[PDB]
Design an enzyme around this catalytic site. Sequence first.
Site, PDB file in Angstrom:
ATOM      1  N   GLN A   1       0.850  -1.187   0.000  1.00 61.69           N
ATOM      2  CA  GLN A   1       0.000   0.000   0.000  1.00 61.69           C
ATOM      3  C   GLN A   1       0.885   1.236   0.000  1.00 61.69           C
ATOM      4  OE1 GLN A   1      -3.740  -0.222   2.526  1.00 61.69           O
ATOM      5  NE2 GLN A   1      -2.436  -1.678   3.655  1.00 61.69           N
TER       6      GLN A   1
ATOM      7  N   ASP B   1      21.747  27.997 -21.724  1.00 62.40           N
ATOM      8  CA  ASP B   1      20.869  26.865 -22.000  1.00 62.40           C
ATOM      9  C   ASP B   1      21.375  26.044 -23.196  1.00 62.40           C
ATOM     10  OD1 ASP B   1      18.586  25.247 -21.582  1.00 62.40           O
ATOM     11  OD2 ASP B   1      17.432  26.398 -23.049  1.00 62.40           O
TER      12      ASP B   1
ATOM     13  N   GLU C   1       2.200  21.508 -16.562  1.00 57.03           N
ATOM     14  CA  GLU C   1       1.158  22.262 -15.872  1.00 57.03           C
ATOM     15  C   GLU C   1       0.685  21.601 -14.567  1.00 57.03           C
ATOM     16  OE1 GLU C   1       0.731  20.835 -18.948  1.00 57.03           O
ATOM     17  OE2 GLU C   1      -0.515  19.162 -18.287  1.00 57.03           O
TER      18      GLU C   1
ATOM     19  N   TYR D   1      22.722  17.564 -27.591  1.00 59.19           N
ATOM     20  CA  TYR D   1      22.015  18.501 -26.714  1.00 59.19           C
ATOM     21  C   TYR D   1      22.654  19.882 -26.785  1.00 59.19           C
ATOM     22  CZ  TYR D   1      19.539  14.605 -24.437  1.00 59.19           C
ATOM     23  OH  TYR D   1      18.749  13.512 -24.173  1.00 59.19           O
TER      24      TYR D   1
HETATM   25 CA    CA Z   1       0.728  26.265 -11.666  1.00 59.22          CA
HETATM   26 CA    CA Z   2       0.543  18.952 -20.530  1.00 62.36          CA
HETATM   27 CA    CA Z   3       3.127   0.850   2.582  1.00 64.17          CA
HETATM   28 CA    CA Z   4      -2.682  18.312 -18.787  1.00 66.41          CA
END
Ligand code: CA
Ligand code: CA
Ligand code: CA
Ligand code: CA
EC number: 3.4.24.27
Length: 315
Positions: free
Chosen positions: A61, A225, A189, A157
């Site tokens: 659990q 970046d 989101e 990258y």
């Molecule tokens: Ca938010």
């Molecule tokens: Ca999304």
């Molecule tokens: Ca557990």
């Molecule tokens: Ca969503």
Amino acid sequence: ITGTSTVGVGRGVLGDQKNINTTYSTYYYLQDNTRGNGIFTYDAKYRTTLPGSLWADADNQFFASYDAPAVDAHYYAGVTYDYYKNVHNRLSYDGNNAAIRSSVHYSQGYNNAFWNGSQMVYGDGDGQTFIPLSGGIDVVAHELTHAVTDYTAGLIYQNESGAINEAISDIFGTLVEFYANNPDWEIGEDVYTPGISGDSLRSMSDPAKYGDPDHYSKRYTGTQDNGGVHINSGIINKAAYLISQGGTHYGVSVVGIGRDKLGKIFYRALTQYLTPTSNFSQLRAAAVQSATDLYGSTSQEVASVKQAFDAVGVK
Ligand SMILES: [Ca+2]
Ligand SMILES: [Ca+2]
Ligand SMILES: [Ca+2]
Ligand SMILES: [Ca+2]
Ligand SMILES: [Zn+2]
């Protein structure tokens, strides 16, 4: 890890109840034997040493708050696996059912998630900017898709190669979210900024909403970046969105062809045509060729791919 396959129950980061595949041997382990060579989820215990300990639980659990990131990391790894298997006939990220490893509770207040070349890693966030990042299905699928990319196209990258890499992960991250079915064209989101409703980390529909470029003319050329891999991804993300949903963007109209065909085209591009140093122009060429392969040169699908890349200024 040699034990019996079982089914546990628990609560995810957003409080939603969830069945998860476990393995019983003395403890119940977050080990899913039903998918390829396994999905294993680890506890990094707030440290940065990886992978950490295979997640053991006494009673099968998983309702403790500490369990929540693990439950989602494990579960959404499963969903992402199912997507690539069911939709693209791809067996795990390497195509040969490689075990999918994830660690949660990485570091403290860690506001990110990543694929480190071997496994996925999820921070718990600082509770302000992020909550545990495994709680976002598009985030999980985003990171898992980096593995797919590294084993296929191998996109560096950095600069435009890197921006494509990022966009591929956003694209398939979103398509997994639609596959699982509260789907949208936003990124992160579900786990981004509790307290503030309606926002996200990135938008594919409208990248400019968070300052990202929606046109090649507006692309970032500085050094931050890794040459703007998360910034210039907006240009490809918008193109993708337009392929799927259609619309008119800087006066260029695009007839949508749906997310299913978006996925088939870009997956074929990723696995057949893209290379480590592909730029946006070569992505266009790969997407046009992929669509031609699947649907034919005179097809609406090929036209819409052209329209979409025209719209974001990628020739
Ligand atoms: Ca938010
Ligand atoms: Ca999304
Ligand atoms: Ca557990
Ligand atoms: Ca969503
Ligand atoms: Zn990424």
